[PDB]
Design a binder for these strands. Structure first.
Ligand SMILES: [Zn+2]
Ligand SMILES: [Zn+2]
Ligand SMILES: [Zn+2]
Ligand SMILES: [Zn+2]
Ligand SMILES: [Zn+2]
Ligand SMILES: [Zn+2]
Lengths: 63, 63, 62
DNA sequence: CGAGATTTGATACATTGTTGCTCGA
DNA sequence: TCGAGCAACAATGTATCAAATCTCG
């Protein structure tokens, strides 16, 4: 068995957790930028640049 | 129920209809701004915003 | 059984309404709401695009 | 009318982003 | 140990197909 079932970060950060399925637009803390939320947002830009790099190198191997 | 195979759009405007896989970054016309490709650039934001609206409608269905 | 539209412009306001010739009967015939505005823009892009192709093909002939 | 060309809603294919969670410094 | 960094869910984008309407002899 391999279940994951993700939960939203910003909702969990200010109080009650809630899993994301359609939640990306409905979030009540979609912006905010409180100093706690503000830090996790930088992590997302970092991870995105990181994962994008690995996917480029993954393409490089076939050539 | 029908076969599919992508080919790059921007490449077709100039001749070399190269099939699309990882080609989006290796493109010899990765940007370019001729009126042929200028329209295609407009075409992509319109279709993307349009399909995104339909993806929202699926959330309205809540199913 | 086959699956088929189901008009887009009607769905935007929720009333669904399948298309069979519904073009003119659409109840939102000629509309400029931000939702229905995109499809009108889509053909204007296509029309300007096809017009460009037919013109350049014509210019070389001289 | 029908045959071929042009719309137009629809979907398969590919890219990019987000969070759970491991593993080795 | 316990974080940095990887990969599984999930969004966003890209191009083509097929129903359908249109153009026209
Ligand atoms: Zn949330
Ligand atoms: Zn916050
Ligand atoms: Zn290309
Ligand atoms: Zn170009
Ligand atoms: Zn309608
Ligand atoms: Zn409308």
């Amino acid at each position: 068995k391999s279940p994951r079932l993700p939960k939203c970060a910003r909702c969990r950060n200010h109080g009650y957790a809630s899993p994301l399925k359609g939640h990306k637009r409905f979030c009540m803390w979609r912006d905010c930028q409180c100093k706690k939320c503000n830090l996790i947002a930088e992590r997302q830009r970092v991870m995105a640049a990181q994962v994008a790099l690995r996917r480029q190198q993954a393409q490089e191997e076939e050539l």
